[PDB]
Amino acid sequence: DDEASTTVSKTETSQVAPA
């Protein structure tokens, strides 16, 4: 829930969207 998009595909590219 840190990055909004998804739990599944939660990688570095996902983490970049907040930080």
C-alpha to C-alpha distances, 10 to 4, 6, 16, nearest whole angstrom: 9, 6, 10
| C-alpha dihedral sign at 4, 5, 8, 9 | negative
Identify the three-state secondary structure at position 14: helix
Alpha carbon distance 16, 4 (integer Å): 11
Cβ atoms 1, 15 nearer than 8 A: no
- The technique is NMR
Which residues in 1-19 are b (16+ Cβ under 10 Å) and which e? eebeeeeeeeeeebeeeee
Q: Are 2 and 19 in contact (CB under 8 A)?
A: no
Nearest Cα neighbor of 2 from 15, 12, 13 is: 15
